[PDB]
Amino acid sequence: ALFMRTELAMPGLQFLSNEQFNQLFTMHGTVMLLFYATPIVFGFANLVLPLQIGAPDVAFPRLNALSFWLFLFGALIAIAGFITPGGAADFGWTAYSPLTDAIHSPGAGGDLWIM
């Protein structure tokens, strides 16, 4: 968001291209909504909810640990689009169709975003 907000300070493209800016708000929104907000809901849940109900542990301790790693490796896969030459997803976190179709989004960054 700092990169976009710096670019939007002045008219004209000073250091970012259209493609890079499009990739930025897509991934910025994806990270904040799905990689920060949704998991920290369960972040606070594992901290106090067993304490709040007077429980010694969660119902499925191993399934609880599986969620963390599924969440950490899933987030890394989507972010890993930034290391591809084409870049990450650039169709927005809404991923409206048919903009996300292979005709209009042929890059692997969108596919990594989906998976």
Partner: protein
Amino acid sequence: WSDALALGWPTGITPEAKLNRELWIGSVIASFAVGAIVWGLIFWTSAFHRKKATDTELPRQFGYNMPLELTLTVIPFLIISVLFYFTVVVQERMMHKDPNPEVVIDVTAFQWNWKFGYQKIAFADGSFDYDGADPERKEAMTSRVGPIRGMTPEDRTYLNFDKIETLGTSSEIPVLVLPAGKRIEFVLNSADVIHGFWVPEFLFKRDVLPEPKANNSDNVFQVSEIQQTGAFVGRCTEMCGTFHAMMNFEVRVVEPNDFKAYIDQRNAGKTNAEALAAINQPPLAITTEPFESRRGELV
């Protein structure tokens, strides 16, 4: 002041825009009144209910006020019900369509520009009639078993084509010329993806869809009239790819006599730029200018 309460909303150039702006100001006034009450209550308890240095016992431990609670669920319901009624009234007026428009415009959105076509002009006073339908180019797109109801995804027959068309360029902003005081019908069709037809002075926008009929989308909206002449910018609002921010257009509103002269020039083979110059108008868009093709300042 209405401008301060509008929070940047344009005044509007159509009666539908004026009605929409009136609803906006009243709703903002209602929202500000509610916000001031809640902010005042929050500030009141934060300044006068702080813990003093001369209190030893805990405060009264009340946590249930049934008469107050029931009252505080009815008042918000009344406000939204009043707002919903005026909301329904305004949208019915804004979405109303007259069976006899005076100007019909075919809006074709594509990646990444615009194309404007004059489908049909029928002045209510009968001083100008023109049929711009081009059915010998609409039947040339048919592609045909087919994956979708016998048609391939490259059918493209949903698009409309006209004899007089203003085609957008990367170094030439497309300018749509409309007469003032006449009912205008806009038909929106998109070639590839979804785009956005937004004139801020219209105080209204609609998404431009490919295959709008197959998606159950009403791609036709009308304005009763445009109340003043001038040039007004238009922008794309729906994320449509790399150049979603660089496909702006302009709407030029002229007098009925001027519009008739401009159409005759276009029928005489003149381009959009020279036909505008023929009616003592700027040849290029004045509210917006084409973006530099260079990818940035470091190129």
